[PDB]
Amino acid sequence: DPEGSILAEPEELNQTEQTTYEVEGIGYDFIPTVLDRTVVDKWFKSNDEEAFTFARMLIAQEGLLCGGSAGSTVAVAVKAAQELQEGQRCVVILPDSVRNYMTKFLSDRWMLQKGFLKEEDLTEKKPWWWHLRVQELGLS
Amino acid sequence: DPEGSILAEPEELNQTEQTTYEVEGIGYDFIPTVLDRTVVDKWFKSNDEEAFTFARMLIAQEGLLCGGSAGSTVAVAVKAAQELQEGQRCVVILPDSVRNYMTKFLSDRWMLQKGFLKEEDLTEKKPWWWHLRVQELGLS
């Protein structure tokens, strides 16, 4: 359940200041009639930054062209599933494709504008020549 | 006695191909009537490169604004006087001033043109930034 929504229980997990989140397709300010929370063994809260970062990591390291909700699901799974041991199996549901978020989190510009990515995080992994000026070339 | 001249004895010291030398004021193709070689204990041959280099070293490390002949004299003295020990004294005669050679060996251009100085010898002692291009500046 994204931050700002009240779907997750118990209630104290839902106490947060901001009611709006950039993640889409999940989280609501009301309990749907369809939903049956009794069959849920546990709930987790998730935020936009980790969700989009995990979606990008999924794209870059597994080829799964999935959206932000899949990123949130995987981010929560990597935490909840620490209890499992070898030989046991876990399943994650990836809702939708990246197509719906082409100019959204998939774009570095939008990520930096929202602050979900910081210049230090973007630059720490770049080559040694990244910071050099074009002045260093033999252009003419 | 500069190379190309026949003043020095014994004769085999004077066997060299080139008869012309850039050093001035010393060396001749004949034995002067005034000269008395019998009172000379030893003779040495000298060349332009070492003479001018020693003159420049004299200027740069002792303040003696002397010409090429003084450089030749000091270059020969530093060789001949190795036999002396502590407590003994040596004298060198420095003929003339640097005034007569202002655009000559005193000029790096002329030294490089004559080949008496090589770019490697000039550059080996320069700072680490010497070879960097002006392109490395923050000019605007």
Swiss-Prot record, chains A, B:
Pyridoxal 5'-phosphate binds at S69. In the adult strongly expressed in liver and pancreas, some expression in heart and brain, weak expression in lung and kidney. In the fetus, expressed in brain, liver and kidney. Changing K104N: In CBSD; moderate form. Coiled coil: none annotated. Changing D96N: In CBSD; has significantly decreased levels of enzyme activity. Changing G67S: In CBSD; protein expression is comparable to wild-type; loss of activity. Signal peptide: none annotated. Changing S69N: In CBSD; severe form; exhibits an activity lower than 4% of the wild-type enzyme; absent capacity to form multimeric quaternary structure. It comes from the Eukaryota. Disulfide bonds: none annotated. It is found in: Cytoplasm; Nucleus. Hydro-lyase catalyzing the first step of the transsulfuration pathway, where the hydroxyl group of L-serine is displaced by L-homocysteine in a beta-replacement reaction to form L-cystathionine, the precursor of L-cysteine. This catabolic route allows the elimination of L-methionine and the toxic metabolite L-homocysteine. Also involved in the production of hydrogen sulfide, a gasotransmitter with signaling and cytoprotective effects on neurons. Homotetramer. It is linked to Cystathionine beta-synthase deficiency: An enzymatic deficiency resulting in altered sulfur metabolism and homocystinuria. The clinical features of untreated homocystinuria due to CBS deficiency include myopia, ectopia lentis, intellectual disability, skeletal anomalies resembling Marfan syndrome, and thromboembolic events. Light skin and hair can also be present. Biochemical features include increased urinary homocystine and methionine. Belongs to the cysteine synthase/cystathionine beta-synthase family. This is Cystathionine beta-synthase. The chain holds residues 281 to 420 of 551 of the full protein.
